């Protein structure tokens, strides 16, 4: 078994990561302002979509970039690229005990398109 140790450098040099994946995801499925719910997909072995966000609904505030899902990159599979979105969640929608006194508190994090479904 041989590993192509030059692949990444060859496509990323002078461009950067995730810049080297620009345009490879095609048309985004969602847009800024859209309400989305996080799908509780299987996490077996790896995932970068925190458990605390599963099943919660948030608002897309930015299409940050295009890139292979971490679930694929972490195992040497970069053949597929998708859009990554920055989602903002109301703290009260994540934590049941959150006080109404701090009703404006939020949490922002990035999630690949695969975990998103229209709210």
């Amino acid at each position: 078994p041989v590993w192509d140790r030059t692949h990444h450098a060859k496509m990323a040099t002078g461009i950067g990561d995730p810049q080297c994946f620009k345009g490879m995801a095609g048309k985004s499925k969602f847009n800024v302002g859209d309400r989305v719910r996080i799908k509780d997909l299987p996490d077996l072995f790896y995932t970068r979509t925190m458990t605390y966000t599963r099943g919660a609904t948030g608002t897309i505030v930015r299409l940050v970039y295009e890139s292979p899902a971490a679930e694929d990159e972490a195992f040497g599979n970069e053949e597929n690229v998708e859009w990554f979105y920055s989602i903002v969640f109301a703290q009260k929608d994540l934590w049941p005990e959150y006080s109404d006194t701090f009703a404006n508190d939020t949490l922002e994090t990035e999630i690949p398109e695969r975990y998103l479904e229209k709210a």
Binding site: H8, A9, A12, T13, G14, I15, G16, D17, P18, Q19, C20, R48, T49, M50, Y52, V64, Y65, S67, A70, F84, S86, V88, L94, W95, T101, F102, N104, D105, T106, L107, E108, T109, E110, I111, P112
Partner: protein, 216 residues
Amino acid sequence: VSDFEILEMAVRELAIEKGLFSAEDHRVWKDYVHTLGPLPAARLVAKAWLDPEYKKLCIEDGVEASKAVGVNWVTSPPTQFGTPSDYCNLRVLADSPTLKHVVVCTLCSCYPRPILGQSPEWYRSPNYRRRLVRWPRQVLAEFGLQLPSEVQIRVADSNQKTRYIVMPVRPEGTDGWTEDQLAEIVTRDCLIGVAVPKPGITVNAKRPVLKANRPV
């Protein structure tokens, strides 16, 4: 010598022997890491406080704005494609009278090293990673920072390829200050979000420092 040092040499010598990377590469990377610090980030905030146009660029395109302070996320690192772990997508979170940010990487220690330097020991702690996202008001209060209840505290979890730095609001008592003077009060902790800039305070709040067995 500890078991860690024994294994570190074994791994490094093995990698070089098998031609995975050269002794030179290793020295080059340590040199690059040695040059990293929080000043560029502080200068970026200072410039933004004095230049509304730059601030807009900071908020919309952090990677571009970073160039103004000498940090090119793509070309500054030895790789010419950004550091492998920090990537090339810096975003600047701008606080406002009704919005205050604080950053964390619940999955690890993801930090904007290129423009800020190395992450604090506590930032990498499971404790900080567990609590900040859920009890930000409480954790920040422990750091001595409290904000109005109506103000939106936004926690940013750096779980993918984006790295953040916080652009705090310019504090009172800095009227007529120059960019240089403003930069001095924007500490590493202010850029993370656990503290806010204060005139006369040019260093992170003093806290216990755990010494290493063999530092340098």
